[PDB]
Design a protein around this motif. Sequence first.
Motif, PDB file in Angstrom:
ATOM      1  N   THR A  41       0.785 -24.636 -70.338  1.00 28.63           N
ATOM      2  CA  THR A  41       0.285 -24.499 -68.964  1.00 28.63           C
ATOM      3  C   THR A  41      -0.180 -23.073 -68.646  1.00 28.63           C
ATOM      4  OG1 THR A  41       2.346 -23.892 -67.763  1.00 28.63           O
ATOM      5  CG2 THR A  41       2.001 -26.237 -68.214  1.00 28.63           C
ATOM      6  N   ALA A 116      -4.814 -28.757 -58.165  1.00 27.95           N
ATOM      7  CA  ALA A 116      -4.497 -29.715 -59.223  1.00 27.95           C
ATOM      8  C   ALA A 116      -3.882 -29.033 -60.451  1.00 27.95           C
ATOM      9  CB  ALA A 116      -5.743 -30.507 -59.617  1.00 27.95           C
ATOM     10  N   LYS A 119      -0.195 -28.114 -59.474  1.00 34.99           N
ATOM     11  CA  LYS A 119       0.593 -29.332 -59.600  1.00 34.99           C
ATOM     12  C   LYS A 119       0.972 -29.578 -61.062  1.00 34.99           C
ATOM     13  CE  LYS A 119      -1.432 -33.072 -60.017  1.00 34.99           C
ATOM     14  NZ  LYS A 119      -2.105 -33.129 -61.347  1.00 34.99           N
ATOM     15  N   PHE A 123       4.889 -29.619 -62.311  1.00 33.31           N
ATOM     16  CA  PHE A 123       5.611 -30.748 -62.898  1.00 33.31           C
ATOM     17  C   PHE A 123       6.309 -30.308 -64.185  1.00 33.31           C
ATOM     18  CE2 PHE A 123       4.798 -33.760 -66.497  1.00 33.31           C
ATOM     19  CZ  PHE A 123       5.967 -34.502 -66.354  1.00 33.31           C
TER      20      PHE A 123
ATOM     21  N   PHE B  70      -3.882 -39.455 -70.316  1.00 34.11           N
ATOM     22  CA  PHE B  70      -4.998 -38.520 -70.416  1.00 34.11           C
ATOM     23  C   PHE B  70      -5.073 -37.772 -71.754  1.00 34.11           C
ATOM     24  CE2 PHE B  70      -1.646 -37.060 -67.484  1.00 34.11           C
ATOM     25  CZ  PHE B  70      -1.050 -36.074 -68.264  1.00 34.11           C
ATOM     26  N   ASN B  71      -3.927 -37.607 -72.416  1.00 27.59           N
ATOM     27  CA  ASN B  71      -3.848 -36.912 -73.707  1.00 27.59           C
ATOM     28  C   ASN B  71      -4.105 -37.819 -74.913  1.00 27.59           C
ATOM     29  OD1 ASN B  71      -3.174 -34.276 -72.736  1.00 27.59           O
ATOM     30  ND2 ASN B  71      -1.052 -34.951 -72.417  1.00 27.59           N
ATOM     31  N   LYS B  74      -7.450 -37.291 -76.961  1.00 33.67           N
ATOM     32  CA  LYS B  74      -7.417 -36.094 -77.799  1.00 33.67           C
ATOM     33  C   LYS B  74      -6.826 -36.380 -79.181  1.00 33.67           C
ATOM     34  CE  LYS B  74      -6.780 -33.204 -73.724  1.00 33.67           C
ATOM     35  NZ  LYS B  74      -5.680 -33.321 -72.732  1.00 33.67           N
ATOM     36  N   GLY B 166       2.504 -32.419 -73.754  1.00 39.19           N
ATOM     37  CA  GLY B 166       2.442 -33.604 -72.918  1.00 39.19           C
ATOM     38  C   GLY B 166       2.512 -34.901 -73.697  1.00 39.19           C
TER      39      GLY B 166
HETATM   40  N1  LIG Z   1       1.080 -30.938 -69.658  1.00 34.86           N
HETATM   41  C1  LIG Z   1       0.617 -30.550 -68.424  1.00 34.86           C
HETATM   42  O1  LIG Z   1       1.002 -31.165 -67.426  1.00 34.86           O
HETATM   43  C2  LIG Z   1      -0.793 -30.073 -68.413  1.00 34.86           C
HETATM   44  C3  LIG Z   1      -1.663 -30.823 -67.459  1.00 34.86           C
HETATM   45  C4  LIG Z   1      -2.997 -30.669 -67.436  1.00 34.86           C
HETATM   46  N2  LIG Z   1      -3.742 -31.379 -66.557  1.00 34.86           N
HETATM   47  C5  LIG Z   1      -3.651 -30.909 -65.141  1.00 34.86           C
HETATM   48  C6  LIG Z   1      -3.143 -31.980 -64.128  1.00 34.86           C
HETATM   49 CL1  LIG Z   1      -1.473 -32.579 -64.199  1.00 34.86          CL
HETATM   50  C7  LIG Z   1      -3.807 -32.838 -66.874  1.00 34.86           C
HETATM   51  C8  LIG Z   1      -4.894 -33.143 -67.949  1.00 34.86           C
HETATM   52 CL2  LIG Z   1      -4.415 -32.560 -69.557  1.00 34.86          CL
HETATM   53  C9  LIG Z   1      -3.628 -29.748 -68.427  1.00 34.86           C
HETATM   54  N3  LIG Z   1      -4.806 -29.642 -68.502  1.00 34.86           N
HETATM   55  O2  LIG Z   1      -5.320 -29.129 -67.676  1.00 34.86           O
HETATM   56  O3  LIG Z   1      -5.483 -29.970 -69.411  1.00 34.86           O
HETATM   57  C10 LIG Z   1      -2.838 -29.050 -69.272  1.00 34.86           C
HETATM   58  C11 LIG Z   1      -1.349 -29.178 -69.281  1.00 34.86           C
HETATM   59  N4  LIG Z   1      -0.751 -28.377 -69.944  1.00 34.86           N
HETATM   60  O4  LIG Z   1       0.269 -28.570 -70.302  1.00 34.86           O
HETATM   61  O5  LIG Z   1      -1.151 -27.293 -70.212  1.00 34.86           O
END
Ligand SMILES: NC(=O)c1cc(N(CCCl)CCCl)c([N+](=O)[O-])cc1[N+](=O)[O-]
Lengths: 217, 217
Positions: A41, A116, A119, A123, B70-71, B74, B166
């Motif tokens: 993240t 977004a 968020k 989480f 969503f993952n 990938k 994730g």
């Molecule tokens: N695992 C996480 O919750 C995470 C979530 C997100 N998105 C944002 C909305 Cl929750 C969801 C689509 Cl992947 C992304 N992202 O941006 O690609 C990366 C990570 N991340 O870990 O780095």
Amino acid sequence: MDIISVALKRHSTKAFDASKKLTPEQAEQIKTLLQYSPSSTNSQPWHFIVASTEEGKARVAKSAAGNYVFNERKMLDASHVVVFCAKTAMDDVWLKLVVDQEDADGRFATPEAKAANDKGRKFFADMHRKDLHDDAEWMAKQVYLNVGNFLLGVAALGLDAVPIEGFDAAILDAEFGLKEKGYTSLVVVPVGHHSVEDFNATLPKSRLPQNITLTEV
Amino acid sequence: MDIISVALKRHSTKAFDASKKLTPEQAEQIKTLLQYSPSSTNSQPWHFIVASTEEGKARVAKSAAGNYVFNERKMLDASHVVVFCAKTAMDDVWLKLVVDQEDADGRFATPEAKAANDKGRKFFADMHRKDLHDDAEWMAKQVYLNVGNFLLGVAALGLDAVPIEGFDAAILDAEFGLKEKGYTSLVVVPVGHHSVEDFNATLPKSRLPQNITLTEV
Ligand SMILES: NC(=O)c1cc(N(CCCl)CCCl)c([N+](=O)[O-])cc1[N+](=O)[O-]
Ligand SMILES: Cc1cc2nc3c(=O)[nH]c(=O)nc-3n(C[C@H](O)[C@H](O)[C@H](O)COP(=O)(O)O)c2cc1C
Ligand SMILES: Cc1cc2nc3c(=O)[nH]c(=O)nc-3n(C[C@H](O)[C@H](O)[C@H](O)COP(=O)(O)O)c2cc1C
Ligand SMILES: NC(=O)c1cc(N(CCCl)CCCl)c([N+](=O)[O-])cc1[N+](=O)[O-]
């Protein structure tokens, strides 16, 4: 190609040549390596202490006591010594700092996008500090990933180094007052150039065969 | 080939192009990187699962069936998908394999050196399982270091990749018989080439300033 040679040839230096210093540009490059490392993240739950002066390395070397005296020379003879540290707790203020920085870098086209991202990180940050209760360990993992990136990186710059876990973290934390600032020392990495006394520089690299550690499906 | 250039230009791929597969040379190189990464006392407390087949990648992507949908794209669109697994416990059989492999590789001049190496590793391994009660986390950290080394390596090979936290480790573990074999999945890393539908490829990089994360002494 190219980094494969670097990976197959790099090694943990056992002795450093105190007279061989990093070039002015290299000193800047290692700092860039430290900061641009990826992290879950983009939390970047770390802090680094880069010691380049005789006095600075001496303060770091205070942690090489007890059964860790075998690492004192390395910490004092290297050109630069990096102390990798992890946050002791993931605070909301820092989380906000991470998102504001991404916003200022032009990563969010709308305010809804920024929200977004907050968020998403929220989480994840919550999952570790409120449910699994392993936030400190989660953050330490990111620092170790950073170390991996850093080791191959300096090796690719033609620099020698050695990752060190053999040191007194309590003594190091106290020396630099990391506890109050909100950090803990995890790995010390001296970087520079190996000396003729580095017996590890001429020894063959050893790893377990892939038939044991790797499975292809 | 400047390593700093790759560090600043690499990124986490949000979407891969299914038609672009790794060359046989790159597929081999990826395994060399996973194998040669350094680790505390050369413990190598890991295991890797590399999915190149569509059926293999499908099984991995099953761990993202929950709220991690969503993952899934990938893990399927990428040429090769690597899941890094950490040992759950450090057994004496593993400590034996490592020191024996080192002996076979000629790192020891005499039988006394081999003994001293085995003693130093056990010293460190005992302190984690007996005193600090954190061997699981200590080994997980080594696996993360491997990931850091890996991400830089593939980036330098000219390949796109993305580390994924994730995913449901419990589902993945059960999907590949892990836990029984003594391992647990930690990170999933799909490797390949990004598609034109990758926004993160055009987006700028964002990291906190050094005045906050770095201190020089
Ligand atoms: N695992 C996480 O919750 C995470 C979530 C997100 N998105 C944002 C909305 Cl929750 C969801 C689509 Cl992947 C992304 N992202 O941006 O690609 C990366 C990570 N991340 O870990 O780095
Ligand atoms: C351990 C780890 C876990 C990650 N998990 C995810 C994930 O589940 N999904 C995703 O899209 N990105 C994931 N990322 C990518 C991070 O968001 C990314 O590394 C960070 O935003 C910095 O961007 P960069 O990798 O382009 O430099 C992960 C990164 C790391 C290091
Ligand atoms: C996290 C970590 C901690 C280490 N700690 C020490 C240490 O305290 N002292 C030392 O001399 N080597 C240390 N090493 C070096 C390892 O033994 C070395 O990575 C391993 O034997 C593989 O050899 P190589 O780095 O030459 O490929 C450490 C390595 C890692 C990754
Ligand atoms: N035999 C090895 O190459 C080795 C040597 C040393 N040392 C000698 C260099 Cl000064 C300590 C003895 Cl004083 C260390 N180390 O620093 O702990 C680790 C390893 N090691 O691989 O495990």
